[PDB]
Point group: D2
Chain length 433, copies 4
């Protein structure tokens, strides 16, 4: 709670309090959220028993995809592999080498960003060729993979949008096939994190069963003991939890920002907790509060990132001249001392709601394994929102400690800064073996 | 089309065109609207055969209520009756006398407007007593009437809201019972219009089968030949067509204005074509277009009626100084010559959409009787939007002529300015007989 | 488990086992049933806050009606009242007198059973007049009561069906009004039981908060502390739990028996646990098992009651010649010793499923008050299925003990044979006071 | 209408009339069916504009798949090709040669039928090798084809069921890939018929725009002018019309037969008009009519084909001793002269409903092109039900003539006995060109 004492307007305070109560979250809501989530999950496993290749989104809005990984690696091997990444704010290319134990090194010097797949994969090939001058692959999108070497996607989430031409944009073909034209073992981000938290940590912490990505997207993978009952091969399941529907709270700003998107009526849970939309949400709140006291630029979309929000949050300067530069170079508004308070309040409330819902999702995944009471297990958390934002990591663990009260010290959160980059390489540790 | 030639900003024109295309309506949409409406109607008759006292809104969002009227009056009688009205912007009280033919006269000098039914009906009784110093009743709300003398409502639409106290606000009791405490034959507005268009007109125009109210609300009644097949007594059915759902087009302004209402998720078709919300819609458009060029008052809700919109529409003054007074005394904004164009454009587009949807509803009701090809019949139109606004009556008949092209000169529109006031009295013409 | 050892056919055993597994119930299902029920309940309270007179069955298939009772009686009074009952297999008429404590006596000598309400209430009046020759009322149907003295119903459940004539069958009018034409304080069956379990028991058992009716119907009422939060007056709420929908298990016999009913697509939970349909379900199972070994009469509907099922269950005769008379005088089939085993097995399985689901409903209502852990409270059970069938009362308490394991000895089941008859009279104990 | 005059039982006649009225179809239903179908179709095109690789079955239960065919062949070429078929009651293998005009010849000597794809495609390879000893492919299942050479399916309809083992049954992989392991240009049945009706017919009949398959399955393809507007490449669209949902009539036999199937809750329109289920439906009707007068074998599933129904229909023998052999060798029931009448009546009614619904589907597809009024076009009909059953082809054209009355002589029905076998070969006429 900020609760700044500087004398502010007696009317603007009401417009602040209204929009703050709009974003308020209470534990009576999270306690229903958890049960909604676990019900959805078991229903999705049931549904996967019936039709192992249909989705049928009017039951289990999660498309609980299968990851053919059948062996959580032990971390005892060697090898040097080249790997490609894609999906985040910019793709990467890693030239990694492994150690006989947890340690692992990488070069990974790499760069990235009416447009078809030809020019895109031409850029892919040219970049990997440039980097080649001194195996696996990662695609961070919803893919339906028959086996390890083969993977085909369904659509184009995250706000990304490939051009619409006769050249048949990427959505609708196997990726390993289209890759070889430019030039193994394709995986996703969450499974990559879950793997990378096995080779890395060891001998002191309980094993890891949950992999969470909080960043440009929001996704999760987890380990399931009953993978033999529900017929599909693979110890860990990829939830596409960015598609939760049931009763999540929605302020009108959310409805407006959803009416103005390509993936309309889908990916509703992702649009509240992911880094791609938090800046837009904050900007749209900061207009119904200033009320024509704003500038001409504050009405222009995509003019406030989540990175600037992370700066406004981590504001411990004696005066607030740190965020003043952000406000000035983003909106050309020389804010007084009465409006920066509103800005800080709004950023705090928005990111607080995001952290609370993410913690609720993590706890609801945890309660499903039911091993929390018997023993302990760890969850590896990755993403730009989590590790690159200190104010986030404390609110998240607070909201998590409050939810699963009694059994709190059985789910250890492990930040995994290595990213899915190392996971793409460690993918070889099972296929090669 | 306005298409004013005065040089305006080259950017503001884009913000105008975007919001204009947002409200655009095309005949490819109306041609599906009509079929949607007729399907809904027949489905509702089917549903009424099964359960004649349940609603079940997940089939036929129309609650096709029964009106016990079993005789379209002939118009040959006499008598002086007192009657009460209620439902519009203000209730009335009429002391009418009838003639041996179409003519009819009335005194109807009357006045009107955490609040319970005791004080409300106390005001009712005191007003009718005051007027008494030289039968029927009208309640313009959704009522489930077992017979003529008895009527009980279900909820409180139109934006009206009776106070919430232990005194059990009006929603949930028979009206004729609660009336006698203050002090016959209760009807609604649409059936009142349909009756009042029988006594009034005669000997030159085909009989009337449709009654439409377009004003603070939007409602319809119609005559059905198959009233014997579908089991309920009464020649005419009251559609509560303010509850259409299927695929009506919604701009984000509509979603925002619906999130801020008491009757949320219900009465969705009424919120686009009724006079109670047009001013609010125009005000909410006139902020995303001026973009901080607005005043402090333009952000205050309920500060622009539909009456002022009717003035801005009927603007034939040499200069636009007629609407300038409206803008000034409503928002304290001395508009230049570049913004009044935007105001006129927005009002035109909004009221145009309203008129188009109303005409679509009328034509879809007409196509259901199927007697349009064989013979001709008339529809009596009433309401503050229709008769008290000259720009509306021409756009409405244009959009109606375009829809039912070939058989246009078989549905004659009759403006009935007498209102349901006379209909309340003529109700006695069947019960007394 | 019967598990009879007499040598039977090796094929007929397979046809028995298939239909037995069709009706199998497991605790993994009940553990989801309870959570479904509690979720539905809280959702219904939420919904009642919004619209206190609409139903909207696509949220909360329970129509959680209000009972204006605001005082659980203490049981210290006197008085002699006449009361009328209706709803079960036959209506009653009671002339009861009260005692200064728990004791209460009654005369209640009474009789009962294209047909309109005129002749029905004529029979009512003639019977009550005949009995008059040496206050309250009970209507066992879904009624929407504004206050105590006034009550209007919605439809006609239980299989009852009033004739369809112009005389406007009973569905759609206030009952207290239509009663006076023949000749207070109308209540329902569940609230009647809940009241009658307060005057009767005392000083040794914890107070009662749940009233359950299991018979021709299946209904429940319960006490809610938060009746002030959710806006309606009355300490106890009448759940119409015969309308549960979510995921109840359905064998094809259920679909066929539901396609052949008047209240189609509604009252789905009642059709599996109520006494009006158990005989029909058993008869329809006993044809797909005997497979043309049946008689001509076994294909005739309504030829096997639940009373005969209670006789077949309570079969402790040395030989099975007790149920042989039932089979003979019901189907004219002189069953051998190989088919009576099938009959007993089928009756056992059906009534077992019924008892299990009823116990699940009771436990799910109990878990909602949340007072089970702190203190203890009792539930009063009434109905023809419960008290008039000894085999039922043991299976029910077994299935209840298994569900709420740890806190079992905090919910005491009290059989209330007095019926709602005494409750109708005790209704006066609050209105008179 | 049969209306046999032989004196039959006066009670059995009632049991016949009840089940006959259960299957009755009236034109007031078909007139709504057509509009339902056309609405669904346009909605599906709209939906395909948005997401060209998702299905989302809660809008447009048709998965209006794309067929990359961009040139209706002209029929002027030569060539000898080998082709494979699959999907019907048994797969085929054709060695066809073409002529410089409509004529075409083929050898096509071929045979066919806990089981994985390895052994299945081993049988495929061994059979094609055996036949090789003196290009295209056809897969009659729902497949999502990115291009011509590549095709991947989604699930396993028609009642077919590949074994469930770790070997990953066929559902979920590209077919052209898995084919080469055993050993072009994969198409479906409806598009095959539509192609084969272009090379074959010419110079006298208007061009063909509709391809219908009525047999073990029921499917349709059609030509669309607006294929440029809705973004996908290909002049003709494959409707998977076996998945219609909206309001098709269902007798309880349908619900029971649907509860006992693998593809439960899906493929609901196919289960009423396709040849795979008509025999089962007739058998299940012929038990509730004979009522224990049946045999032990009449209660055994899959004991009556549609081929025997075609024999019972085409019964013009002086006595009915032709169908008597069918009844005897199928059920071991020496039917009297009073039961064969019931059998004929039931078969007639069932196949009549099937033909009526198929004609409704054809007419509803026709009304969508809207070219019926301006010019004429032909539809090529194929399948075991149509050409191999003379009683079907007359009822179908009757029901079609009644539906589209005025414009009847603009849609010419062309029986195409050649099958999709020739279409698989003619597929080369566009890819080779």
């Amino acid at each position: 709670t900020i609760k700044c004492d500087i004398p502010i307007n007696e009317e603007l305070q009401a417009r602040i309090n209204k929009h703050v109560n709009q974003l308020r979250i209470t534990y009576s809501t999270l306690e229903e959220f958890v049960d909604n989530f676990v019900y959805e999950l078991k229903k999705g496993l049931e549904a996967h028993r019936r039709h192992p290749n249909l989705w049928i989104p009017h039951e289990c809005s999660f498309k609980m995809l299968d990851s053919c990984i059948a062996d959580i690696p032990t971390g005892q091997e060697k090898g040097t592999y080249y790997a490609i990444d894609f999906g985040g704010t910019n793709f990467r290319a890693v030239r990694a080498s492994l150690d006989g134990n947890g340690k692992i090194k990488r070069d990974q010097e790499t760069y990235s960003l009416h447009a078809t797949a030809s020019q895109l994969f031409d850029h892919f090939a040219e970049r990997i060729k440039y980097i080649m001058g001194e195996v696996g692959f990662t695609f961070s999108f919803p893919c339906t993979s028959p086996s390890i070497n083969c993977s085909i996607l369904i659509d184009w989430t995250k706000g990304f949008e490939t051009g619409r031409a006769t050249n048949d944009p990427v959505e609708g073909r196997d990726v390993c096939k289209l890759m070889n034209d430019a030039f193994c073992c394709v995986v996703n981000d969450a499974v990559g994190t879950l793997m990378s938290c096995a080779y890395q940590k060891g001998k002191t912490t309980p094993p890891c069963y949950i992999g969470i990505i909080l960043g440009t997207g929001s996704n999760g993978c987890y380990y399931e003991p009953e993978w033999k009952k529900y017929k599909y091969s693979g110890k860990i399941i990829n939830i596409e939890l960015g598609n939760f529907d049931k009763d999540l709270p929605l302020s009108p700003i959310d409805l407006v920002m959803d009416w103005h998107s390509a993936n309309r009526s889908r990916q509703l849970f992702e649009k509240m907790i992911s880094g791609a939309y938090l800046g837009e949400i904050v900007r749209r709140f900061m207009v119904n509060v200033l009320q024509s006291a704003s500038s001409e630029k504050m009405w222009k979309s995509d003019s406030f990132n989540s990175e600037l929000g992370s700066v406004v949050l981590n504001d411990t300067s004696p005066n607030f001249e740190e965020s003043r530069k952000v406000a000035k170079d983003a909106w050309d508004m020389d804010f007084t001392d009465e409006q920066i308070y509103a800005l800080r309040k709004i950023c705090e409330s928005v990111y607080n709601r995001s952290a609370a819902l993410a913690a609720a999702a993590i706890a609801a995944i945890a309660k499903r394994i039911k091993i929390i009471e018997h023993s302990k297990f760890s969850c590896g958390v990755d993403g730009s929102l989590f590790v690159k934002n200190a104010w986030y990591c404390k609110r998240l663990q607070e909201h998590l400690k409050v939810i699963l009260a009694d059994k709190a010290e059985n789910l250890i959160i492990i930040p995994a800064d290595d990213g899915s980059g190392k996971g793409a390489a460690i993918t070889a540790a099972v296929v090669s073996q």
